[PDB]
Amino acid sequence: MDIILGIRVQDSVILASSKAVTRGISVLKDSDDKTRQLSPHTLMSFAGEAGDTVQFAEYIQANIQLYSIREDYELSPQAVSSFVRQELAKSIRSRRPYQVNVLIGGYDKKKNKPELYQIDYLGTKVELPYGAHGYSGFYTFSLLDHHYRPDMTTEEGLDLLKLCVQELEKRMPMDFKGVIVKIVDKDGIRQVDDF
Amino acid sequence: QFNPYGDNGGTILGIAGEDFAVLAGDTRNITDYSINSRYEPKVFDCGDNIVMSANGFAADGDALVKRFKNSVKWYHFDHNDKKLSINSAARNIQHLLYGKRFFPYYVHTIIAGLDEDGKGAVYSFDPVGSYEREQCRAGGAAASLIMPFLDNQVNFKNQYEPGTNGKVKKPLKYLSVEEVIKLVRDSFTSATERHIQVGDGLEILIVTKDGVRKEFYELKRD
Amino acid sequence: GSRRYDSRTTIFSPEGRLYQVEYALESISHAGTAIGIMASDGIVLAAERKVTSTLLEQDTSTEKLYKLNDKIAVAVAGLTADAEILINTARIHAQNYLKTYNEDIPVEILVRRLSDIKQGYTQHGGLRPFGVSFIYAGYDDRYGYQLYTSNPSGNYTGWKAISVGANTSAAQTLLQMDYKDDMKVDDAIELALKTLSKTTDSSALTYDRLEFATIRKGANDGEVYQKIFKPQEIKDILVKTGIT
Amino acid sequence: NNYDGDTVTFSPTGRLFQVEYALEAIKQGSVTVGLRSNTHAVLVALKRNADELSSYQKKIIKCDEHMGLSLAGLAPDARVLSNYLRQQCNYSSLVFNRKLAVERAGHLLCDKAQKNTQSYGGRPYGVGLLIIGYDKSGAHLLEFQPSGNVTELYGTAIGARSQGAKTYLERTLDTFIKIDGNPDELIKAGVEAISQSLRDESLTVDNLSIAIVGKDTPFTIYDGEAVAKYI
Amino acid sequence: TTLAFRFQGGIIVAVDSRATAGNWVASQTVKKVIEINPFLLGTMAGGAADCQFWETWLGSQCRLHELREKERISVAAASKILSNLVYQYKGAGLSMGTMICGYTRKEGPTIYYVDSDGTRLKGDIFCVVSGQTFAYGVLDSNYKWDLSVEDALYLGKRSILAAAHRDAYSGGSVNLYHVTEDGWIYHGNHDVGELFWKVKEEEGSFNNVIG
Amino acid sequence: GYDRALSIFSPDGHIFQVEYALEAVKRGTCAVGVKGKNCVVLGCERRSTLKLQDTRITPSKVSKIDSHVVLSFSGLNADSRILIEKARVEAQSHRLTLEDPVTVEYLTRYVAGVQQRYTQSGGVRPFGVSTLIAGFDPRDDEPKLYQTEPSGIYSSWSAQTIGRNSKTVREFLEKNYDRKEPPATVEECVKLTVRSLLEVVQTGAKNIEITVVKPDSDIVALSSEEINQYVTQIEQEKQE
Amino acid sequence: SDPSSINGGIVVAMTGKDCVAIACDLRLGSQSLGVSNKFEKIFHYGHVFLGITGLATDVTTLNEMFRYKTNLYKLKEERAIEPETFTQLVSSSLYERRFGPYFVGPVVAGINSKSGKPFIAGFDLIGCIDEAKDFIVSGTASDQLFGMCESLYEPNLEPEDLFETISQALLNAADRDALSGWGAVVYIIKKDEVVKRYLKMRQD
Amino acid sequence: DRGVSTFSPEGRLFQVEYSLEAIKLGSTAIGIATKEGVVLGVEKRATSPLLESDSIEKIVEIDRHIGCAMSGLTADARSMIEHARTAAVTHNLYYDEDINVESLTQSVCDLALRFGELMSRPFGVALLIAGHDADDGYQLFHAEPSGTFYRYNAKAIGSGSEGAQAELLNEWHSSLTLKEAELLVLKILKQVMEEKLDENNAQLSCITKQDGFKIYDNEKTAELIKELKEKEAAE
Amino acid sequence: TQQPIVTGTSVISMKYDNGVIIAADNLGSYGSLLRFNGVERLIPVGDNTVVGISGDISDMQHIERLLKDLVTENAYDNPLADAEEALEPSYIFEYLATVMYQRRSKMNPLWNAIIVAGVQSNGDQFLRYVNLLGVTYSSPTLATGFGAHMANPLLRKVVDRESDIPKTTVQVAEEAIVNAMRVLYYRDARSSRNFSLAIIDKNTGLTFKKNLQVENMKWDFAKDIKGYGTQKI
């Protein structure tokens, strides 16, 4: 199964996502990026049913990009998260619901605060210091419930995330072929190569 | 519940010669263990030197053949009486079949005729419209009995030149219409013996530059 | 058939004007004057009720000043009924935005939508345009205090101070003369009333012929209050500014 | 005058001017002749070119193996009506395994034309058709007017100078009706009929268009060096 | 078995030709590569009709793009046309496993895997071994980036032979295609029956066989 | 639904509603486009009949369609918003399906297509708008400037103007713009655009807007003071 | 599988002398896994309080929906909606999804601003109204809350007394439910003051 | 006012006859059919020297075997070209071959009379549709907004048509080479054009069986213009 | 998609030298209950066609109305309605076949098996079958339900092939049909003694026989059968 983790530190949001795409007993890719840049300071990671995941993320990306061009303004993460939740909340009672679970990591330039949102395919939304989707949820959560500190720095956050991935590799039965890590801060969205 | 599909049995065989093609089928129509008709044609002249058979569910086969016959009529109307080439007919039939992709035609479709170079051609389709051009094809209930024979006797498969000990394959050669008809008769005679749904009669349509001619041979009625 | 009786409400004149839009603007020029003034610390909306009676219940009456949400109000000039159709549409858009994004709608986005509806009635459908001009007074946390106007054409523009309805030419000259950028709300209240008092076709400006509203950060700390003035409160501000 | 703005308006004398204007488009069209015996039915059509570089506009359209028409007026309107006949002929074959009777083909064209004369927004058809066919009651010739009026005839002609051909056929009635089991002689009578409508121009190899249907003859069109025999 | 991998010399595409209905071998000459345009190739795995019909349709949509924009369609754009179409029919029972391979100046050599599930992936190597799609070759040991074209062709041919022997539903003949700048080149059809014996003798592999 | 045919032919083969739409454009404030060697500049007139205007919030005349393409217009302001909205939606729709931003030529062809459709559709009048569409194609350094009009025809221009007194500023550009050597720098190109507007504008104060678009989504709008420095230098060279 | 017990949680409301109280837990889970301990289930539209238990996507959706509807009400009516009227609006809104319902257990609490009369109500997922004098319960530990309320409750309790009763009713009910707890909030509501208290409780 | 589909007392549709007037105001387009191919030429007619002429697209590809030149309200042609391209490709999808030039023309002409109170008015543009097919070889068609189409050995449309057509009447024979036809289109365009014909204000194109439909380079057309000037000066 | 409620059993038919014969019993069964007697299941269309129908009776009565409506419609603007443009057996069949296949393809079938018997204009014998699936076929002998299993074997001993049709008289053909109806009464638990028989001859036209009874039955041998094996009394 797919690993997507989010940790919100003092001044940034870090998203770790598994790089493997598997359908049954076949591994289709070992370099997959399960992330879409919604806006310059907002990043969305997604896990779920094949096709639905990318289609939903690209659909959300297009709508947020349209808003940005039309108003020459960046929607706040709180606003972007609410839009995404509502699209999912529509889809559950639709003919064929989108089976996608997302993490939204954004930096709010107005409040100068990083924000992390966890949304499931039903349109269930919460704001959290740290979040995750799937089987990797029960482990990471308890681990982070012990190590996470509200005033942690980005470097401290990466080390804790590094620990979570290492422990997940040992404890998880499926091979998720490593993770891709992306940081969201005031300066924007960057990818951490060394991990 | 109501089941919209049925099986009317029968077997169709298409062989392509150098300057001719044959499409043959048994004239027997069955349901379950009863015989519906000992003579009910399944190989039709569709015009423009094209012969077509849709074998499986008889209702779906009759409907498809009608739609293609209609399709040929409207080709002439919309394209200044252009002759419909076998490759164009094949592509048209794919679109007919794929139209009912989510409520398929339960039939095996073979069409025979001459290609634009005047060489013999056979086209074979699956129920949902997948098609391919072939030298040989058998369709229907007794397809599994006949196709191996045709592989051996038409394409000379697993046959080598005596004294080479499998070093050199038997040379491929174009069969005459007379040789091809013998293989068709032998294939149906054999299939009739071992398949309960095959028998009563055999109708062969031969396609040449001169046109479409029809040969009929009796089969065992048990 | 039916072609015989069609006015064709969405065609250009040989001069490239829209007949029905131009005629609708003529209608609005006869409506009671509405003024909006934007200050550093708030916005004022002042408007004149059209020739009233002594038997009109004023305290339960509303024809000029309407609330769109807690942050945005409009002053109306034209057909009141036509305005109420558009006001209810705007109130719904504001609540649609809040439901989708969980943020109060920015003033311009609401203005642009109402303006785009008006535009549609001029380009398709073969129906008459809305005989309405709006002054939008609003606050958001992007551009702060904002004044806009829209007219039947669906065109909209931003303003420091503006007038719609009757005697706008005269009103706009008086505002352009006395308005300064460093101006405060108390000053803007005085300017608005002094402008109506000079432009009015009535003999004198009294409480029973006015609707008045302020949008102030004069709300305890970091928030915005809308005040639709009561008859007695309009009477008091008329004495304070020294008009009665 | 005041009553020709649309097809939904009667004049004070009970005339439909839009229909009468449509009828005018036919008279401007090039001449076409129709005649039949007991065994065969023939169409002869004079095709019209734009200039010497241009082709000669096709006049005859096949509707089925046993039926087809010649057109005079708006060619696109002939295309719409012929397509409708093709469909109705086709429906009869598929559903009832029945070749559509020529008389019933007439009844269907009539009813399609009528609807365009009683409803606002629409317009009448601007073309006249000569339908020939062989069915279970033998050879047939029909004349269609976009008013909706369809008439069964031994012979007729429509288009510019059609009156010349129509008079000739009215004299030859007793002769050409008896031309049974001789297609060439029936076409000769048709070519001699259309000749009575020519002025200045004569019948050339790329000018003349002939069609025939009969007892053991499918509806076939002859153009080019195939009609040189009859010139 | 369909194979498409990327190397210095371009793209190698190798497929088998067997079609089955249950245990019945319906055809051994099926063409599992569709030539969309001179620079674009599509492989077919899953439902024969689904792949044939929609990849032929894709060729039409690619042709219209060329006309409307006076330019070759990008592999990314062509792949997404097919991926967006199948996504509309998602859950209706379409069975499709397909790789869109082409070269364009804008992107260079590109392979996109397009699924009936609506999955669209870009990668250097994709393999479909009956019912299973992999990001690795059947062998994958011999795979190095810097390979001779004629050397790379053999790896693709050898890889199809490996699957053809072991997999019951793979067999018939091997069809080879080489995709480069200025179009693709057909490298012929090789009957597995003849190929197997030759390869065995020359390579000294399949020792578990006996012959 | 209202089906009435408002754009029809006249006995002389003219569509008056489309021609009257061009009259709406003639009334609009002047807009000019000039492309240099490595840039395109969009100059726009602001009629000074409206003061006490809030320039912070008032709709600007140049609109970004994407990060690399801009649209200016002359004619009905309300009508222009509908074309801008449709263009912005199509720009994101193209990115979503082709996985590449629109070429300037493609975005132009789309907007021109919409304008045409509103000339032979029942119950609708044509757009009282002409557009200048400028920008750089993805990964291209060749400047692009296109024009559209209510009829739906479009074409590419070395330099072009639309709106009131466009005949005058086109006259200026036709004698002052050399094809063999276009404005080499941004300075030269902005100068020639400001010069072209000064032929028509009145005062060089808050009446001229300038937007510079450079390759690779580099778009900036000049301020009052920056434009005022060009206005000062042009007239000081003219005093000779 | 059962939508009304995926996320878990509880709400309880009580009446007192010239006051009402409404309280909820703070847990949101994916069945056994606890995700959030900040998921409040009590919302207020003016002086009318609404608690919602059940599927969390529907709790959020109905909050956004009733905020929408009460905002439009206030703009048109020129007054805040009252508890009795809001109760009828909740019922109406739920029954219009009769054959595709929101999987929720709503609870209304508030004092009528004119009559000063304390008011509470509960609803089933399709919008049937339970208008009890004493107390209303909702959620995965409804059986436990019914037990606690039925024994602890007496009529005409003073505000500071009613607080203790409703707090002990929630806390002890939540501790006997796997899908409830992780904190609790209690609203004491008088005619013109409302106090909100977070309770210390076990986090297992 | 009056119906859009109204007949005149002479039995002609007002709106169709009026659209034919719009086409007369259009820039000239010429087509010549030979046994070696079909040539298509147009006058570009730029409204200003600042207008980049190469952006004026009045010769358009429909398929590899069918070209198209336009004259009149050229914006109206975009949806007709779109339909033609869709018809040509759709037919190739359904029948695995190239569509007949007559069938493609017939498809475009079926849109013509789809107007009433469907689109609000007829098309204000005429098309020259040139192509090759195996059945009827090299063909040139004239598609009008009436829905009528004629085949032509040679045809001119637009402002200089009746002058050009009279010239084509004398010059065309059945033995014309492709090189002869190119020069002949350039000759007649240069005759009816207001401005002096060069490689920037005129555009050539042809359709051959071998190479299909090609729009000529400005450099290629320039050489044929220089070849024309010399052969006219030769007597 | 439904289930048949009130049902009719076998329809049987064959060709002879000069025409065709068709027969069917007068019963409408409600499952195991033999509820309706006197139900006519042979429905004549003009004087050249008889349509025999088995299966759901409600669907039969619907088809009866379609055929009644087909005769009315054919007469409309048709001066040769009683001559050259009269309804042919082949026309009536192709219509029913079209309806049957359309109804199955909307997953809402007419729950019937139909045999169209008649003589064409040129005197050619017509006999073709269609059912709820839209499946069609022709044979010198045709039968539905139990008839297919028991009647066909007996009728095929008179006409085994096409060449046997000229050698088969109307007396021989009718004898074979009447015997087959007796066999079906012996052996079909959903048959009745009372039946209708229709002859369509190219010379003598349409003869419709009602209130026919199975006669010359063999039961006497029953008295001699005691027990299931070992019982002697």
Short mmCIF file of all heavy atoms in Angstrom, two decimals, chain A residues 85 89 92-93 118 120 122-129 134 137-138 141, chain G residues 7 28 32-33 35-36 39 55-58 60-61 64 100-103:
data_model
loop_
_atom_site.label_atom_id
_atom_site.label_comp_id
_atom_site.label_asym_id
_atom_site.label_seq_id
_atom_site.Cartn_x
_atom_site.Cartn_y
_atom_site.Cartn_z
N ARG A 85 -11.98 19.52 0.01
CA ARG A 85 -12.90 18.71 0.85
C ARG A 85 -14.27 18.67 0.18
O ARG A 85 -14.85 17.57 0.06
CB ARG A 85 -13.03 19.28 2.26
CG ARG A 85 -13.86 18.40 3.18
CD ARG A 85 -14.44 19.15 4.36
NE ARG A 85 -15.79 19.63 4.09
CZ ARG A 85 -16.88 18.87 4.06
NH1 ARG A 85 -16.80 17.56 4.26
NH2 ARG A 85 -18.05 19.42 3.81
N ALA A 89 -16.56 15.67 -0.94
CA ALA A 89 -17.88 15.53 -0.27
C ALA A 89 -19.01 15.42 -1.30
O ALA A 89 -20.02 14.76 -0.98
CB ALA A 89 -18.12 16.69 0.66
N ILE A 92 -18.77 11.49 -3.02
CA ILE A 92 -19.21 10.26 -2.29
C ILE A 92 -20.63 9.87 -2.70
O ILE A 92 -20.89 8.66 -2.80
CB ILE A 92 -19.10 10.37 -0.75
CG1 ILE A 92 -19.25 11.81 -0.24
CG2 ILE A 92 -17.82 9.71 -0.27
CD1 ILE A 92 -19.83 11.90 1.14
N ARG A 93 -21.52 10.85 -2.91
CA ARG A 93 -22.94 10.57 -3.25
C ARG A 93 -23.13 10.62 -4.77
O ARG A 93 -24.28 10.55 -5.21
CB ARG A 93 -23.87 11.52 -2.48
CG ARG A 93 -23.45 11.74 -1.04
CD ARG A 93 -24.54 11.50 -0.01
NE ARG A 93 -23.99 11.83 1.30
CZ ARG A 93 -24.38 11.30 2.45
NH1 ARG A 93 -25.34 10.39 2.50
NH2 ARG A 93 -23.78 11.68 3.57
N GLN A 118 -5.43 17.00 6.57
CA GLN A 118 -5.67 15.59 6.19
C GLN A 118 -7.13 15.46 5.75
O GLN A 118 -8.01 15.82 6.54
CB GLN A 118 -5.35 14.66 7.36
CG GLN A 118 -5.11 13.22 6.94
CD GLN A 118 -4.90 12.32 8.13
OE1 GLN A 118 -4.02 12.55 8.96
NE2 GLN A 118 -5.71 11.29 8.23
N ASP A 120 -9.88 12.64 3.74
CA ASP A 120 -10.14 11.27 3.21
C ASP A 120 -11.18 11.37 2.09
O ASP A 120 -11.80 12.45 1.94
CB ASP A 120 -10.49 10.28 4.32
CG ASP A 120 -11.88 10.39 4.91
OD1 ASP A 120 -12.60 11.34 4.54
OD2 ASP A 120 -12.24 9.53 5.73
N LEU A 122 -14.07 10.56 1.66
CA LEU A 122 -15.45 10.91 2.07
C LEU A 122 -15.60 12.44 2.17
O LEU A 122 -16.75 12.91 2.14
CB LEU A 122 -15.79 10.24 3.41
CG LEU A 122 -15.63 8.72 3.47
CD1 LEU A 122 -15.98 8.20 4.85
CD2 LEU A 122 -16.49 8.04 2.42
N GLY A 123 -14.49 13.18 2.27
CA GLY A 123 -14.49 14.62 2.54
C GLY A 123 -14.39 14.92 4.03
O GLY A 123 -14.89 15.97 4.46
N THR A 124 -13.78 14.01 4.80
CA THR A 124 -13.45 14.21 6.23
C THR A 124 -12.17 15.03 6.30
O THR A 124 -11.16 14.56 5.75
CB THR A 124 -13.29 12.88 6.98
OG1 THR A 124 -14.28 11.96 6.53
CG2 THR A 124 -13.38 13.05 8.48
N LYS A 125 -12.20 16.21 6.93
CA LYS A 125 -11.03 17.13 7.01
C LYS A 125 -10.71 17.45 8.47
O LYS A 125 -11.65 17.66 9.26
CB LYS A 125 -11.27 18.42 6.22
CG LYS A 125 -10.07 19.35 6.16
CD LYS A 125 -10.33 20.65 5.44
CE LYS A 125 -10.92 21.72 6.34
NZ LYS A 125 -10.60 23.08 5.84
N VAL A 126 -9.42 17.49 8.80
CA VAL A 126 -8.88 17.98 10.11
C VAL A 126 -7.56 18.71 9.84
O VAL A 126 -6.88 18.35 8.86
CB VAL A 126 -8.69 16.83 11.11
CG1 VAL A 126 -10.02 16.25 11.59
CG2 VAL A 126 -7.81 15.73 10.55
N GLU A 127 -7.24 19.70 10.67
CA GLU A 127 -5.90 20.36 10.71
C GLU A 127 -5.08 19.65 11.79
O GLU A 127 -5.61 19.49 12.91
CB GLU A 127 -6.06 21.86 10.99
CG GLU A 127 -4.83 22.68 10.66
CD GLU A 127 -3.72 22.66 11.70
OE1 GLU A 127 -4.03 22.56 12.90
OE2 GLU A 127 -2.53 22.74 11.30
N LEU A 128 -3.85 19.21 11.48
CA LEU A 128 -3.01 18.41 12.41
C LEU A 128 -1.56 18.90 12.39
O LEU A 128 -1.09 19.43 11.39
CB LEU A 128 -3.07 16.94 12.00
CG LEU A 128 -4.46 16.32 11.95
CD1 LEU A 128 -4.40 14.94 11.30
CD2 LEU A 128 -5.08 16.23 13.34
N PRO A 129 -0.81 18.70 13.50
CA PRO A 129 0.64 18.92 13.54
C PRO A 129 1.36 17.92 12.62
O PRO A 129 2.31 18.30 11.96
CB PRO A 129 1.01 18.65 15.01
CG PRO A 129 -0.30 18.84 15.75
CD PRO A 129 -1.31 18.24 14.80
N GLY A 134 -3.52 5.44 5.42
CA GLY A 134 -3.32 4.00 5.22
C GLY A 134 -2.73 3.32 6.45
O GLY A 134 -2.78 3.92 7.55
N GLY A 137 -0.34 4.60 9.03
CA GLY A 137 -0.88 5.60 9.95
C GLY A 137 -0.67 5.21 11.39
O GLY A 137 -0.09 6.01 12.13
N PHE A 138 -1.10 4.01 11.77
CA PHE A 138 -1.02 3.58 13.19
C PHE A 138 0.41 3.66 13.73
O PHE A 138 0.57 4.10 14.87
CB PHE A 138 -1.57 2.17 13.36
CG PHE A 138 -2.81 1.86 12.58
CD1 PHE A 138 -2.83 1.98 11.20
CD2 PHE A 138 -3.96 1.41 13.21
CE1 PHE A 138 -3.97 1.68 10.48
CE2 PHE A 138 -5.10 1.12 12.49
CZ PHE A 138 -5.10 1.25 11.12
N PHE A 141 2.01 7.71 13.63
CA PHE A 141 1.23 8.51 14.60
C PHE A 141 1.81 8.38 16.01
O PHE A 141 2.30 9.36 16.54
CB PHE A 141 -0.23 8.09 14.57
CG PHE A 141 -1.13 9.07 13.87
CD1 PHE A 141 -1.60 8.81 12.59
CD2 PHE A 141 -1.49 10.26 14.46
CE1 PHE A 141 -2.41 9.71 11.94
CE2 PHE A 141 -2.30 11.17 13.80
CZ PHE A 141 -2.76 10.89 12.54
N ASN G 7 -16.38 7.15 12.26
CA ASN G 7 -15.59 8.26 12.86
C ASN G 7 -15.81 8.31 14.38
O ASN G 7 -14.86 8.68 15.10
CB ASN G 7 -15.93 9.60 12.20
CG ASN G 7 -15.79 9.59 10.69
OD1 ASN G 7 -16.74 9.88 9.97
ND2 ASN G 7 -14.61 9.23 10.20
N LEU G 28 -12.00 12.22 16.57
CA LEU G 28 -12.30 11.75 15.19
C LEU G 28 -11.35 10.59 14.88
O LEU G 28 -10.13 10.76 15.11
CB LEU G 28 -12.12 12.89 14.18
CG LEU G 28 -12.52 12.56 12.74
CD1 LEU G 28 -13.13 13.77 12.06
CD2 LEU G 28 -11.34 12.04 11.94
N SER G 32 -10.77 2.03 14.38
CA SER G 32 -9.92 1.78 15.58
C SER G 32 -8.88 2.90 15.75
O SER G 32 -8.58 3.24 16.91
CB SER G 32 -9.27 0.44 15.51
OG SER G 32 -8.62 0.28 14.26
N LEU G 33 -8.35 3.42 14.64
CA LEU G 33 -7.29 4.47 14.64
C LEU G 33 -7.90 5.82 15.04
O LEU G 33 -8.88 6.24 14.39
CB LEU G 33 -6.66 4.55 13.24
CG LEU G 33 -5.61 5.65 13.05
CD1 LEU G 33 -4.45 5.47 14.01
CD2 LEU G 33 -5.11 5.67 11.61
N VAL G 35 -7.45 9.75 14.90
CA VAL G 35 -6.77 10.68 13.95
C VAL G 35 -6.60 12.06 14.61
O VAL G 35 -5.46 12.57 14.61
CB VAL G 35 -7.52 10.77 12.61
CG1 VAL G 35 -6.87 11.75 11.65
CG2 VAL G 35 -7.64 9.40 11.96
N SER G 36 -7.69 12.63 15.15
CA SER G 36 -7.73 14.01 15.69
C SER G 36 -8.45 14.06 17.04
O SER G 36 -9.47 13.37 17.18
CB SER G 36 -8.38 14.94 14.70
OG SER G 36 -8.43 16.27 15.21
N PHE G 39 -11.55 17.70 17.05
CA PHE G 39 -12.78 17.67 16.22
C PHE G 39 -13.99 17.98 17.11
O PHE G 39 -14.65 17.05 17.60
CB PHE G 39 -12.94 16.34 15.49
CG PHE G 39 -13.89 16.41 14.33
CD1 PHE G 39 -13.51 17.01 13.14
CD2 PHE G 39 -15.18 15.90 14.42
CE1 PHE G 39 -14.39 17.08 12.06
CE2 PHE G 39 -16.05 15.97 13.35
CZ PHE G 39 -15.66 16.56 12.17
N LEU G 55 -21.14 10.39 10.61
CA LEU G 55 -20.10 10.49 9.55
C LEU G 55 -19.58 11.93 9.54
O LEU G 55 -20.41 12.86 9.43
CB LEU G 55 -20.71 10.06 8.20
CG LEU G 55 -19.71 9.68 7.11
CD1 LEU G 55 -18.92 8.44 7.48
CD2 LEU G 55 -20.41 9.48 5.77
N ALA G 56 -18.27 12.11 9.70
CA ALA G 56 -17.61 13.41 9.96
C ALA G 56 -17.70 14.32 8.73
O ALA G 56 -17.81 15.55 8.93
CB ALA G 56 -16.18 13.18 10.38
N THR G 57 -17.66 13.76 7.52
CA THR G 57 -17.80 14.51 6.24
C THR G 57 -19.18 15.17 6.19
O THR G 57 -19.29 16.26 5.59
CB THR G 57 -17.57 13.63 5.01
OG1 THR G 57 -17.66 14.47 3.86
CG2 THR G 57 -18.55 12.49 4.88
N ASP G 58 -20.20 14.54 6.78
CA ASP G 58 -21.60 15.03 6.82
C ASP G 58 -21.77 16.06 7.94
O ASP G 58 -22.57 16.99 7.76
CB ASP G 58 -22.60 13.89 7.01
CG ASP G 58 -22.78 13.04 5.78
OD1 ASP G 58 -22.22 13.40 4.71
OD2 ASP G 58 -23.50 12.02 5.88
N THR G 60 -19.42 18.17 8.96
CA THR G 60 -18.77 19.36 8.35
C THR G 60 -19.71 19.95 7.29
O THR G 60 -19.93 21.18 7.32
CB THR G 60 -17.38 19.01 7.82
OG1 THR G 60 -16.64 18.44 8.91
CG2 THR G 60 -16.62 20.19 7.27
N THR G 61 -20.26 19.11 6.40
CA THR G 61 -21.14 19.51 5.27
C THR G 61 -22.40 20.18 5.81
O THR G 61 -22.79 21.22 5.25
CB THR G 61 -21.48 18.31 4.36
OG1 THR G 61 -20.28 17.91 3.70
CG2 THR G 61 -22.53 18.63 3.32
N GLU G 64 -21.65 23.71 7.40
CA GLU G 64 -21.47 24.65 6.27
C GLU G 64 -22.84 24.98 5.66
O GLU G 64 -23.05 26.15 5.27
CB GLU G 64 -20.50 24.06 5.24
CG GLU G 64 -19.06 24.01 5.73
CD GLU G 64 -18.11 23.12 4.94
OE1 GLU G 64 -18.57 22.44 4.00
OE2 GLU G 64 -16.90 23.09 5.28
N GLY G 100 -31.45 9.16 0.22
CA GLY G 100 -29.98 9.30 0.12
C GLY G 100 -29.44 10.13 1.28
O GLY G 100 -28.73 11.12 1.08
N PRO G 101 -29.74 9.74 2.54
CA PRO G 101 -29.65 10.65 3.68
C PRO G 101 -28.23 10.92 4.18
O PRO G 101 -27.36 10.10 3.93
CB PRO G 101 -30.43 9.90 4.77
CG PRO G 101 -30.20 8.44 4.44
CD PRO G 101 -30.19 8.39 2.93
N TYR G 102 -28.04 12.06 4.85
CA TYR G 102 -26.84 12.37 5.67
C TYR G 102 -26.86 11.42 6.88
O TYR G 102 -27.92 11.29 7.52
CB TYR G 102 -26.82 13.84 6.10
CG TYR G 102 -26.76 14.83 4.96
CD1 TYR G 102 -27.86 15.62 4.64
CD2 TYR G 102 -25.61 15.00 4.22
CE1 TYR G 102 -27.82 16.54 3.61
CE2 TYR G 102 -25.55 15.91 3.17
CZ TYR G 102 -26.66 16.68 2.87
OH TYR G 102 -26.60 17.58 1.85
N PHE G 103 -25.73 10.77 7.17
CA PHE G 103 -25.59 9.76 8.25
C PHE G 103 -25.16 10.48 9.53
O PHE G 103 -23.98 10.38 9.92
CB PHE G 103 -24.63 8.65 7.83
CG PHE G 103 -25.09 7.84 6.64
CD1 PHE G 103 -24.50 8.02 5.39
CD2 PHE G 103 -26.11 6.91 6.76
CE1 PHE G 103 -24.93 7.28 4.30
CE2 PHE G 103 -26.53 6.17 5.67
CZ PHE G 103 -25.94 6.36 4.44
#
